[PDB]
Write a protein that binds this ligand. Structure first.
Ligand SMILES: C=Cc1cc[n+](C)n1C
Lengths: 156, 39
């Protein structure tokens, strides 16, 4: 299958027609997406198969073919870009200054951008093009708008 | 049966569209991976 680094759509033919359920990142031979997109199921890439390797429901992350490779972090000051990949639409970069999710276990960056559910797993990047996390696990605030955490895994 | 299809390279775009605010929110994360607002 295709193992070239980059951003990929995650599709299914189980529902009506071909439906985009999410997005992911291929880096260093490992496919990275959010757990809620695949539910830990195996994936196809052309004629090849990608098996899950690590996952965690609470972090809402999953890696295929190897361990989680993404380790860049938001610096807490600079604007970032969401590389949104919406269903049936071309990949597009959106620049934004993240907000913060404050939790009892520390603070996490958060992006206030609203895209269809099928955009979950789209990468958020810093100015060097490094992936600092994935978009698509967040909350709906007072005025009904969506705010996603910048969700990043640990590189063992 | 799920499958993947390449959608692009991962690069920073100079002069990309700039939008979104930066809210500071108190949140809780449950064991099922769901975030909720703390008030
Ligand atoms: C990726 C976007 C997303 C995930 C969950 N919701 C409600 N939305 C709008």
């Amino acid at each position: 299958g295709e193992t070239t680094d980059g951003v990929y759509r995650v599709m299914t033919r189980r529902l009506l027609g071909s439906t985009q359920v999410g997005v992911g990142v291929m880096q260093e031979g490992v496919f990275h997406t959010m757990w809620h997109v695949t539910k830990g199921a195996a994936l196809r890439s052309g004629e090849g198969r990608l098996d899950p390797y690590w996952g965690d429901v609470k972090q809402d992350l999953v890696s295929y073919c190897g361990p989680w490779k993404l380790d860049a972090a938001w610096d807490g000051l600079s604007e970032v870009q969401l590389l949104a990949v919406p269903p049936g639409e071309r990949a597009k970069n959106i620049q934004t200054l993240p907000g913060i999710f404050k939790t009892k276990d520390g603070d996490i960056g958060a992006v206030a951008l609203d895209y269809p559910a099928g955009t979950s797993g789209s990468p958020i990047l810093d100015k060097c093009g490094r992936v600092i996390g994935l978009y698509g696990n967040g909350v709906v605030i007072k005025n009904g708008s969506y705010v996603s955490a910048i969700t990043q895994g640990k590189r063992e | 049966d799920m499958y993947i299809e390449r959608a692009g390279d991962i690069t920073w775009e100079k002069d990309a569209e700039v939008t979104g605010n930066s809210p500071r929110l108190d949140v809780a994360l449950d064991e099922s991976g769901d975030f909720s607002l703390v008030e």
